[PDB]
Amino acid sequence: TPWSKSELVRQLRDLGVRSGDMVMPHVSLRAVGPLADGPQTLVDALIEAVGPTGNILAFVSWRDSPYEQTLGHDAPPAAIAQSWPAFDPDHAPAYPGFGAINEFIRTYPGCRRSAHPDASMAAIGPDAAWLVAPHEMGAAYGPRSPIARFLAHAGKILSIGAGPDAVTALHYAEAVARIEGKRRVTYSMPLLREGKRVWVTTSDWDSNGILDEYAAPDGPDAVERIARDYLARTRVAQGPVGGAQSRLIDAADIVSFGIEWLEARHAA
Ligand SMILES: [Mg+2]
Numbered sequence: 001t002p003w004s005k006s007e008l009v010r011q012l013r014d015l016g017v018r019s020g021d022m023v024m025p026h027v028s029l030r031a032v033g034p035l036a037d038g039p040q041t042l043v044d045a046l047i048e049a050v051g052p053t054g055n056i057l058a059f060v061s062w063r064d065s066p067y068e069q070t071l072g073h074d075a076p077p078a079a080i081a082q083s084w085p086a087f088d089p090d091h092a093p094a095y096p097g098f099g100a101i102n103e104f105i106r107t108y109p110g111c112r113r114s115a116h117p118d119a120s121m122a123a124i125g126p127d128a129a130w131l132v133a134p135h136e137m138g139a140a141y142g143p144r145s146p147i148a149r150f151l152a153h154a155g156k157i158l159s160i161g162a163g164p165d166a167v168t169a170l171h172y173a174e175a176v177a178r179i180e181g182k183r184r185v186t187y188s189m190p191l192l193r194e195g196k197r198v199w200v201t202t203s204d205w206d207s208n209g210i211l212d213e214y215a216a217p218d219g220p221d222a223v224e225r226i227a228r229d230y231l232a233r234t235r236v237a238q239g240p241v242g243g244a245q246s247r248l249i250d251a252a253d254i255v256s257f258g259i260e261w262l263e264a265r266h267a268a
């Protein structure tokens, strides 16, 4: 039987989601199983679980980010520069690789969307505008980003059948860790400024491996290794949401753990 909205809501409360919470979800839809109305049912369930004073923050990115196409160049290659669409937060679809739920989140009425095309975040709830801005180039996941404000806002990470590599907030630990050898990347994004396309080139921390030993394309990256160690070392509520093994994680706690984890292992 397809999972109903009200069944999902009871499971979320069993897991510890309370009215008023600030939740960032990472979802494996195939793990959850058939829903009564497809993925919207789970989006509906999450909005109901956090209530009208609660907030959802999701890492949605952009289906057509020109990250790899501009990676490593001090300007976008001519053919990219001429024809790439400017990022338009009202119409740019979500990146499919983080899960099909994120397109449903970002098109929810009243959803706000942050201005960073590659790191774009969507937020639903009364604090959404405060969560999504500022989001400037060169500050994808660290201080001054939506992840930073989420960590200051009692944020909980809701992993619904997702792996330990999925925890976006740990890129904040990578950004502030006092470790030698931190990898950076250079890329370019096309922004809308007054409705004209403007190409902006920036550097930021490499989010595909903060150090060489974590940059193997198959992993494990540092996010996976930190989260795997954290979950073996911490009491975290675990339970089903739909058919999926799910956990509800204290975001500030896992990020503080990750900062200490990196600084213990790598000289300053
Ligand atoms: Mg909209």
Ligand SMILES: [Mg+2]
Pocket (backbone or CB within 6 Å): 053, 126, 127
């Ligand atoms: Mg509030």
